[PDB]
Each structure stands twice: as structure tokens, then as C-alpha cells.
Amino acid sequence: FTGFNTPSRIEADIADLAHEGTIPQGLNGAFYRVQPDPQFPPRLDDDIAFNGDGMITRFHIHDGQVDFRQRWAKTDKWKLENAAGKALFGAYRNPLTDDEAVKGEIRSTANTNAFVFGGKLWAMKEDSPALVMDPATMETFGFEKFGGKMTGQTFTAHPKVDPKTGNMVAIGYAASGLCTDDVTYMEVSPEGELVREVWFKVPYYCMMHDFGITEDYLVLHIVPSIGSWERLEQGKPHFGFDTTMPVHLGIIPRRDGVRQEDIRWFTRDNCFAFHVLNAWQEGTKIHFVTCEAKNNMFPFFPDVHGAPFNGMEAMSHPTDWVVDMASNGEDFAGIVKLSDTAAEFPRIDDRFTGQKTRHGWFLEMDMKRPVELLMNCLFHKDFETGREQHWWCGPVSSLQEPCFVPRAKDAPEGDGWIVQVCNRLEEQRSDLLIFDALDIEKGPVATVNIPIRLRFGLHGNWANADEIGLA
Template structure:
């Protein structure tokens, strides 16, 4: 991930392209499993027009949604920009009128009052509808066949937060979605609203809480009983925003915080745990057993994002931006507000991790992510020297056996986030496929790799004839979850 966020988003493989593309029948090497009937949908972004400020966050790039449609052993591809209000008004003007990441005080006067979300973080499917997400705004609904933008969605007015996380969770036993919005009542507000949205898309339960300080709550965890709310050190307030600063500053003197409360309560049982400096971005999964809550998460040691400056003026320290598979344990029966942290594997990993989502909230032993395997070759002559180890491999962690196995994508390749696809008819945890895009830095094209999720052998590879827009998050959905067969027939 560092390689994406440092200097390469505006050059080389990730240079902006502005184009929207479609391939009816992609070129394939190997084979496409015939039981894969569904979509791999990716959301990421690129700056359609260059940022107004050179120190802006790459996270501020314009949202782009792309879709690999698998059916009958063939794959089609489609990619489109999300028509956010920002995209539309910038396109009309022919330039970027929006300032620093989530700081409207730095926007041009011409776009004052225009929602500046870029909706570039993750896709979501719920109740048969497709959305793009960014944690500073509501979901934007997208037509799953054409990828055309439909517009902001507030669940028929039931969703009261002005914002919606990019990482909702699902209870696989009920199909209900749990999600939240932070800065829920406006810029730098300390309100967080949690919701349960039933499987039909109706808001069924709300919890309103306050946070001790306003920080990135990028992800959270759900158990059968609790919600777990991690944030740490990133900080904002109206004063620094009015002063024209980027939305987040890193303040390592602030405690790392993890809040835990009942998922069906009213928030009055919320308990805050505190710990030393960490950077909390993504989680794998969590469970509640009696008074014990455990959280599996690939957390970083310190500030991961070089473009969110350290508030003490110290330079960004890449050695702190390392993530590991970690287990956090909380004792709700104790008055102690600390947690225990175990690092389960000593291999540094990328924090974009996945589990077999059918085991979300439930006992689970398999986790997947990407990492830089430095024992593998890298053809610097053909791929170009990026000055660091490429993210060239998938890792499969078996927590029960304490065993890590891996898949190597190629000696000119850099992998984006991995996704898990369950094998049809099998309910065994982790039985299925791993898929994700690889950037072939030599051929300057994007490939989709399909790997057996148990043996980690390659099954097939889909070649795009171009560099696809970068991905933040991607997920697989079976065709039925989107009613795709009917919607495609109507289109």
C-alpha cells in the first residue's frame, strides 16, 4: 500500500487516465471456474483533474467503480467514474475546484455548498442494490448493469447520519447490515450514529454515541453481541480546518481508543479501552465469548499515511507504517481499560485483509491478505525500480495451525487487495477462490488472478489491455445477491 500512497498515484502505472472502458469478453489464460457466476466489483479512484494543492491526499482522488462479471466460464469488464457532485461540477469547469482532503474551507467559492465526497473507497451490496462508499458522505447508488450513478441514498430517510462508513458489516445468520457514520452531524462533529439495517434495506435500530476526540473511524468490528470501535491518533477540529489544513493530523500523544458496546443496546454501556500508539485502519473479524471480546486485525504500529502530517512536526517514519496479523483481547468483566495485543505472525503484511465473510461475527480460523515476499524474484529491469519491495504475494493464515502459506503473482507484478469467493455448494470455511488484480509493471496492464483459496495454486488469469484505475477495496458478490440475471435481461 505504501507504494500506492507515496509518489506513484500521479505517475507510472497509476498515472491518471480519465477513461471509462468496457470489454465484452476478456482475454483469459488458464480457465475461469464455471461455478463463478457473479461480479468482482472494485472501487478506487484517480484525480480526474490534478489536485489543487500538491500536498493533497491521494485518498482525495475521484471515485471509480469497475466490475468483472463472471458467467459461463467467461469474464466481461466495465469501469466508470462515479458521478459525484464534485465530478460533475469539476467536469463542467474543466478543472479541480476542490481543495484539500475533506476541508471545504480550501475549496473554490464556486463550489461552496457542493458535497465534495469522492466516493472512492469501497463498493457495497445490500438488499439487492449496489453502492459506492466513502466515509465522509452517504452511499451513492450505482446501477449494477451499466455502472451509471443513481445518486445519494439515505434508506428512505431512516439513516440520520450525514456520513456512512466504507466498511459495513453483516451478520451472516440474519442478513442484517450493521454500519455507522462518524462526524455524523457535520464537519468535525463528535457524533457517531450506529445503525442496524435489515436485509430488506430498512433501518431497524439506531444508537447515538459521542467520541472522546474526533478521529478516523475507518473500520469497525461486529460480533454476535457487540460492536467494536477502534480509532487512534488521527485528529481534526474546526480550528485546524479553518486554518486551511488537511483533514487529519497525527497526534501520537493521543491515546489509541477502542470502544465496545452492545450492538442491540442504546449506547449507555459503551466502554472505552486505551492503548499505546497504533494506527487502526482495517479489521479481519471479532467474537464475543462470555465477557471476553477478541478482535483479529492487521493494525499498523504508527502513522500509515505520509500525507497526514505528524502534528509535532516530525517527519513521517516508514518503519512505523508496518502492519501485522494481530489479536486484541478485551475483558469486559474487568475494570482495567487496557487490552492485550498479540502479534500472531511476524511477517509484515498489507492491512487490506479478508476473511470468508460467511464467518463474520462467528468463530473463524482463516484470514487472507497481500504482502511483499522478499524471497521471491523481482525483474527490476522490465518492471522499473520503485525503490521498494513489490506486494507480490497473497498470504493465507491458518490461525488454528499457526501456519502461513502464500501465492506469488509474478516477477513484474504488484498485487492489489485480495478477495474471497466461496465455492458454490461448499460451506467449509475458506473453500473457494482468491481473486484480485495484479499490476504488471512491465506490460503496463492490469491482470485479474484467480487462485484456489486452499492450495493457493493459480487457476486462471484475465488480461486487461490497459492499466485499470487503482483499487482501494473490492468484493465478490454472487449474481443472485444483485438479481443480476433479471437486471441484465432488462437492460
């Protein structure tokens, strides 16, 4: 709650932000990103940054200028707390520490991702229904339960769009209640109607924060960041990592009326994997590129056996998990490390989700760079040519999730730009950087001064003027 991460709680508007360079005329749409930002002082003692109320930033880029708008995501939690004028909810994913006054309420802070789909803005916390908002006015409508047709109590913060159907693919884990081994597989039409919701069990309850899709399958990685009521009763963090448990990859056919028996389960040795770059089918093989670390990535979700955090072992690298559908038995066809670069927050050109993509972008941790006072490089890989580009934000800055933007509705994979918030840490201010996606190492084409300090953000997405009602 201090330093770079001073609370903000500023809703605002500013037209035509100052910039150093030229803003590409091609850009006509909006980058939406979210920051955890607590409305009130925390109810408990040392709450996590990951746990603040969702504040949704939007950078509307058009006619070679940038406009700012930041609004609260008005969760049930935000409203009840607002009215009550005080914190009513407790720790991250721990209903046990809530005021009795808010028992049975939707605890979502809608603080993890901000996503445009079917002419709505989705503010997402994977423990809850998505909060929907107006993409243009950025008013809150309320949580999306699709007219009581959703039966699952949760919705992913890492949804995927099938380019073929245009559908949104989603899971919801702890679907029947907290720490349950149920999971819903959902699909949503471009119009916004919920068209499919399949229940199924997973080998064990764990953090299923993400997944892949291919042309036919949902690929779901099961990594033993595990939880239980036991943990919560003793007031431990909701999740802890168990290095002694196997890692699974479930293959769910994306067709109507699937059963547990249709789901193919592969198993490998213990590792930590987190965010999914992309997956595709290669005949009978499925390629699943995730950012794999040797061990636990999150100090705050500790080793369940009291073993202390191993920073070295938390370094993640893009990795291909391959599995053959046509085989028998649980073994992986193989595991291929795609780069020695330490990377996470992976992005693809969304238009090619499920097809083998040539390009990926990541936030990189390069410990060889000076720091004169932490994710300090933008990283682009050409998987065809093997060629890796790096851009460094310099010694007093750090970077937030990059967001790919197409040059046109019809441009090749990777022909466009990268937009990303940059933390000017020593100056306690923020920039929006705009790069050539395919030549990032020459530096950003435009450095845009953001006249409000933004906090450590999480996930963010692009939409055209035509998808958000600013045509």
C-alpha cells in the same frame, strides 16, 4: 498523476477477456472494485491519489469467461464539476479550499469501496452518505439518505454484514459536521430500509475508517490519527498522528435504543491499527483482530510534532486485541501478535463475520523479494493449523486487495477462490488473478488479461449472479 498512476477516465465494456489457464466454472457473479481517478486536473497543486473521483470496475465471471465494465460513480461532485467543466472542490477532507459555488455540497468522490447489498451497488466515502448505483447497469441513482431518515451526515466505507440477521452494520463519524466527536451506529435490513441509527460520542475525533462486529456488539477502535478546523485553517493534512495519546476500543451493544452509558470503553498504550480482519465473543472476552503497526502508517497524515515518518514502525501485523466485558477498569486482557508476516487489506469469508474464522487472506510486504525497476505477495493464514501460504507476483508487479469468493452458497469457510487485480508495473498493464483460496502458493488457476490499464485501487467485494440481477 504519472507512471503506473496515469489518469484513465475510461468507461468501457469488453466481453470474454483473454486468459492464461482455465476460469473456474463454479464462478457465477461479479467482483466490483473501485479506483480513485480524477475527471479534471486538480484544483490545488500536489493532490493525493486517495483523492481522485470514484471509477467502479466490475468483472462479471460466468460460464468460464470474464466480461469487463467500468463506469463513473456519478457523485454530486462529479456532476457539478462535469457541468462546470472544471475542478470546483479542493484537498482531501478540506471544505475550506472549495470554490464558494459548491459550499454545502456533498464532497464525496465515492472512491474508497464498491459494495453490493439489498440489490444496490454502494460506492462509499466515509465522509459522506453512500452513493447507490444499479449493480447490473452500473447507472448512478444518487446518494442514500434513506428518505431523509438518516440524520448523520456520514456513512462508513467499511460496512459489515451480520450473517445472523442479514443486516448491514455501519458507523458514520464526524456525524454532526467536520471534526465533530459524534458518531452514528446504523443498521440496514436486507430490503434496504434503515432500521436503527444510534448517536453517541467517542473519547476524541480521529480517523475511524473501520470497526468490527460480533454476534452482540459493534467493536470500534479509536486510534489517534486526529484532526481539527485549526489544522485546515493552516492548510495541514486533515489528519495527523499523535504518538503520545492512548488507544481505546469501544464496545457498543447492537440493540435498539442504546445510550452512551451502555458503551464499555477499554484503553491501551499508543499504537497504529487500521483495517479489521474480524472479531468474535469468547464467553465474556471479545477477540478483535486488526493490522497493528508500532507507529503511524501514513506519511501524508504526518506526526503532529513534526517527527519524520519511520518506515520500519509502519510495518503492520495481524494482532489479537482481547478485552473481558465481565471485568472492571480500562485495561486490555491482552494483545497477541498472530504472525511475523507484514500484512494489511485483510479478508475473511464474509459468511462467518462475527464468528471466530479459521482463515484470513492479506496483501503482504516482503522486503526479502527482488524488485527489478510495494505490496508484492498474497498471504493466506490457517489460524487452526498455524500454516502460512505466500504467493509472490514476481519482481516487476504488485497486488491489489484480494476478494474471497465461496465455491458454493453452502461450502465450508474458505472453500472457494481469491480474485485480485495484479499491477504489471514494468508492462504498464493489469491482470485479474484467480487462485484456489486454500492452495494459493501453487499460483493462480487463471491469469486474465485486462485490456485497459487500471489504476491503484482500494476496496472491492464479490456478489452472486442472484444478488446483482444477472441470473
